[PDB]
Design a protein around this nucleic acid. Structure first.
Lengths: 49, 81, 64
RNA sequence: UAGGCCCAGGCGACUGUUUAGCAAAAACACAGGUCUCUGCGAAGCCGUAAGGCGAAGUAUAGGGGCUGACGCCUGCCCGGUGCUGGAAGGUUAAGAGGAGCGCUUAGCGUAAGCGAAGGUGCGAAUUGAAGCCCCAGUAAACGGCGGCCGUCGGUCCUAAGGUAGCGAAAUUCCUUGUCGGGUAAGUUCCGACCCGCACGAAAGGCGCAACGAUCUGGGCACUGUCUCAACGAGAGACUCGGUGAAAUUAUAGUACCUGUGAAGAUGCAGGUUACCCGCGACAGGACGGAAAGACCCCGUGGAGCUUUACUGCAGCCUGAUAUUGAAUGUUGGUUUGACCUUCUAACCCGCCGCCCUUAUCGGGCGGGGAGACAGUGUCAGGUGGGCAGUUUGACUGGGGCGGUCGCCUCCUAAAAGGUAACGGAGGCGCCCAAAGGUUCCCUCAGAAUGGUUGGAAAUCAUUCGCAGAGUGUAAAGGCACAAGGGAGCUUGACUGCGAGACCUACAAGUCGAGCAGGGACGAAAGUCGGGCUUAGUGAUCCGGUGGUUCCGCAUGG
RNA sequence: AACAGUGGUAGGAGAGCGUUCUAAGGGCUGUGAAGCCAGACCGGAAGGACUGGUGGAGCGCUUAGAAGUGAGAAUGCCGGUAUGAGUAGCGAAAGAGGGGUGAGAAUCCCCUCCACCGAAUGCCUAAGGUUUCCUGAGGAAGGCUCGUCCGCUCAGGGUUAG
RNA sequence: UAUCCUUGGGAGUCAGACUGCGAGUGAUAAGAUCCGUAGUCGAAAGGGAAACAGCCCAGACCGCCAGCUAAGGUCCCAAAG
RNA sequence: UGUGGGUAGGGGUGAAAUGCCAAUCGAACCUGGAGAUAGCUGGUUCUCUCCGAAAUAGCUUUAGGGCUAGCCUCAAGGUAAG
RNA sequence: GACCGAUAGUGAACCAGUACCGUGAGGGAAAGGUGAAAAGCACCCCGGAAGGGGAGUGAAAGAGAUCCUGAAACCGUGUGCCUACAAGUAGUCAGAGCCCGUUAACGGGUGAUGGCGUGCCUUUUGUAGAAUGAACCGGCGAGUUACGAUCUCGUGCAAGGUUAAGCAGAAGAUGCGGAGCCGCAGCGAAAGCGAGUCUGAAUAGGGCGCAUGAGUACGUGGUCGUAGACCCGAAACCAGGUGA
RNA sequence: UCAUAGGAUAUGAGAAGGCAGACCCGGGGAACUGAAACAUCUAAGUACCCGGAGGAAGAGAAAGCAAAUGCGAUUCCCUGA
């Protein structure tokens, strides 16, 4: 509140929307893989483990 | 008691903050403005440009110097290193 | 009771990696013939909340 | 112990009633008058409804409004608002309607795309009551009854312009109006006059005997009301005995002169004065006590009240539909619905008779009356201060009324910038498709001379002429190497942007080289992202339009 | 050690004092706890000891912890007591005397006079009150004083219907 | 000469007054009002101005029965010619 | 005038004053919602130390309120710009 | 029970929803403590009694029926010093005389006389203020709690931190429980891409980001938010009832 | 007129009413307040009234969740948020 001054959010506009079918994939950044042994397979199951 | 009024002289415009904004011998960046004005109290010179608002800006970096166009007429200029 | 998020500001702002708040400009809704294209190209772009306003409001957006 | 009386006036006819606890009245009521409504299940009113008052009445009655005995009277306006009635025509709902339009899709399809049926959504014409618009009437309905010029006339406007009667009034500011009466002296009173600031005919006008703890003026008598106080009696007061509170209270060994000081000192300064303690008395001060000022202001406080403030509700009116069907006709396009008549069995009867039942309830039967109406439910329109919830700005040399509320320019402004006042002066809410861009061109106003019409002043040549002119517009700044004035070609009055700066609480606002794309003018350099700069405009939400390699709730749309 | 500094409202920061309770550990206390009253003690402050007296059974110290954690003011709430002040008032109205009672009498009882009411201050009786009625004891409170007295306190008793 | 900038936490303040100077409104009146500027008060005791928020001098940790000074003063109230 | 009854609050009654409705009435009283709300006033309890303001701007159905900025404080950094 | 301990805590520790108030609904108190045990005061006197003084009981009678302690306001008695020519927010500093003799130290109580000096709180530009509040004493009496967020500090573990509900477990600690949450990668409206991304025609520029990396769980503290949210305080509004 | 209404009689541990100021199921259903006014909105389907209960009530065995080589009644708790 600002004492009857039109506050910031109202004087500003809305923008955009949200998707229902959004995918926020879990991200690995390729250096965390160096912790694994050579030639070993990799799976999300394994990573959760 | 009496009753009076009607001054009708009770307004003025918003003050616009003219004048110089940088000083002689002061280092300046490109695009910096130097002297807000209306019309030409001052002209541009070297490496200086005028805008649609009759305002003066530096086209380059350098140092400011104010001078005179011979008689009764002033100038600015930017000189680099 | 969990804090309630301020939904209008949620609809209007977005959070950044540096904690700053992205925003849009005003004067960009309906009345454009009375404005220069310079203004308009400047105003379709985004902006950032100022420090004072941020101090005012940031508690309303802890939950984003 | 049991009237004081008289003269005159205003108001109200009277007797009565009223603000318990400030106001007894000129207020209310009154009988009388008038208007209006209402045909009896009256009307009105209470209630969600049943049920009731009205009324165990029936238009010589009942309800409501206004006025107020009585006497003489109650003038002109129906233009506006109301009511009443009409109502050819226009407009207007819901409901009915159902031309078309979308979406989807089987299928056709190389593709693009088209695409039947069905479903779904939107839906035009047409119809559609009251009401409103419109026309008459009505003033003891709301309400209204003027001005100018001339020395009765002429004129403007009115819907109509105040009749009678009364009149410095309970209305008259000027005003103690003028005159007269009354008085030595009368802003009062009475009677007359009328240039009635701003009487007036049922908000009744004028008068009026009787009446009034009414208001007012004058007079006789009487009086300590007074001149001007004196005395006496009694109850308190005072003393003694017995009993024994309260309000208030920062602590106090609490003087006055002047001065100071939050501008009125006990308490501060200086000076003066004053032995200590009490009793009776007074009430000048302690801005004394009492009551968080009832006036004034403020509060985005409240409550009550009004209304042609807003939004709604009840109630009322009207229509569609269901209860709610049987016919005879009628007109329409496709049988169908609509309309007028008729019938009855629905429904209804605060109509009768019988039984339940010794019952003015109801409820069954029989009749009778009305009748698919009404009533009720749902939906819709209108009316609707009857009722409810709410709003009804700020600044302000108190408030209110006035004025202003945003933007631009100048002064005030104090030689950066900035800087207030209900301080001083002025402008804007645009304009130009050329008044823009570019290239090229040249230079103004006025003055003196000469010269038809030409004229002081057009147009003319003429020398003088920084600028006295112009610059779309207000002013300031600025510009004559043009930013001023002409001509040609054009649309950069472009798209994406933007280093970096200004101003700034924020929001925002301002300038900007330079890059890319595509161009305009120009040979070229090169200029052009509107105008000579500064005003010429407003958020967000909400909707609308167009475009879109975005999303589209199982999938495709 | 040296140098410099140390007024302060709103307000920010930091250091601490003290109260209640809890845990642990170490203690005091009938040879006298807490609490209360005095005292000329100690500490920079909040504050803390010591001695004596009263009292007559529970309480400190240390480190930590947790809080209904500190009052001079709200025309604050409750209670108590003051001031005013032995002041105002002691609530319309004729009493006086003699006897008596009694510890004690203006005030109670008896007598005599006087005075007031008398369409009322008299007799009946409703509503209402609910033992106030009668008798005998009492005078702590109430009685606007006193009180030997009563519409007060105790006991007892008392209200009879075709 | 040491305070400056940034970020972050926490505030309070938005009734100001007088004095001197420069201005306005006013009547070149106001202990007026409104602005700018410097100071003091506010939030600052002490000495003087008799007293006396805002004037002059000057800034308080505490003590001392020491001294030098400012403003202002030196016949007595009242220290000093 | 008595007795017995009736009318009850968004209401009743009213020879009307806005008067009366249990010492009240421009909308009774009790309870509850309810610790209503109060940009308003009053009050807000131990000490010492360090530092130390503002009474201004802008916007405000805003003017005795609020928000941001300005002015204060604390801490960590930059550090030496001031 | 890191709940109260008689103004608290139930309104109510006691014959309380009583007394009392109100027509009524309804409102609504106050008031604890002998002693281990009545052993509760035989008897003598004063007195009409009450109430005392002795005696006696008892550890205690200064314990005696409001009965443990028993403060202060207030009320009085006695007395050391001062006081009846003095004006004073009542004290302070200086100081004589007089009287005493300590938690034994440049001590104590009074104080003639001199100097200086207009109370406290609030609210104010400014108050001794003739602005407000308090008669006084005593007690009670106002920024807290839950949940969540954020900052700081601390601890633990660290590109990994952490469990919740729940089960077992003395109302516990603990173990199990990894479902979930925060962070490690951001940008974009979104599809989506990815240390890049968005805009854009653009390998351009620009924004946001990375490269310049530390979070997370818990606790203390500060602040905020939602809840009566520092305390008291309205006029008033609504619902349901009581009253002619 | 059957016949019915209505009436008469006998049986019924019927049901009535109360509550514990709490829990729940429903029918009715405020305002203050907040929105810094205010009507939409909130407060709040709260308070309050009413009727029904039971020791629990209510819901409850899919015309579902959903979108995988699928889960299989309700209820409640933690999360999701």
């Amino acid at each position: 509140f600002e004492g009857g001054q039109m506050p910031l959010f109202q004087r500003l506009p809305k923008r955009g929307f949200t998707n229902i079918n959004r995918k926020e994939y879990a991200v690995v950044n390729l250096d965390k893989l160096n912790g694994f042994a050579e030639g070993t397979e990799v799976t999300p199951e394994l990573l959760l483990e | 008691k009496k009753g009076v009024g009607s001054t009708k002289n009770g307004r003025d415009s918003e003050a616009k903050r003219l004048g110089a904004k940088r000083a002689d011998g002061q280092f300046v960046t490109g695009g910096s403005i130097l002297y807000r004005q209306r019309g030409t109290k001052i002209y541009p010179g070297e490496n200086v440009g005028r805008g649609g608002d009759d305002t003066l800006f530096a086209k380059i970096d350098g140092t400011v110097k104010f001078e005179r166009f011979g008689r009764d007429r002033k100038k600015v200029s930017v000189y680099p290193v | 009771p969990k804090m309630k998020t301020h939904r209008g500001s949620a609809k209007r702002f977005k959070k950044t990696g540096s904690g700053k708040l992205k925003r849009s400009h005003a004067y960009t809704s309906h009345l454009f013939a009375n404005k220069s294209q310079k203004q308009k190209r400047k105003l379709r772009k985004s902006a950032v909340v100022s420090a004072g306003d941020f101090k005012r409001i940031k508690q309303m957006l802890a939950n984003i």
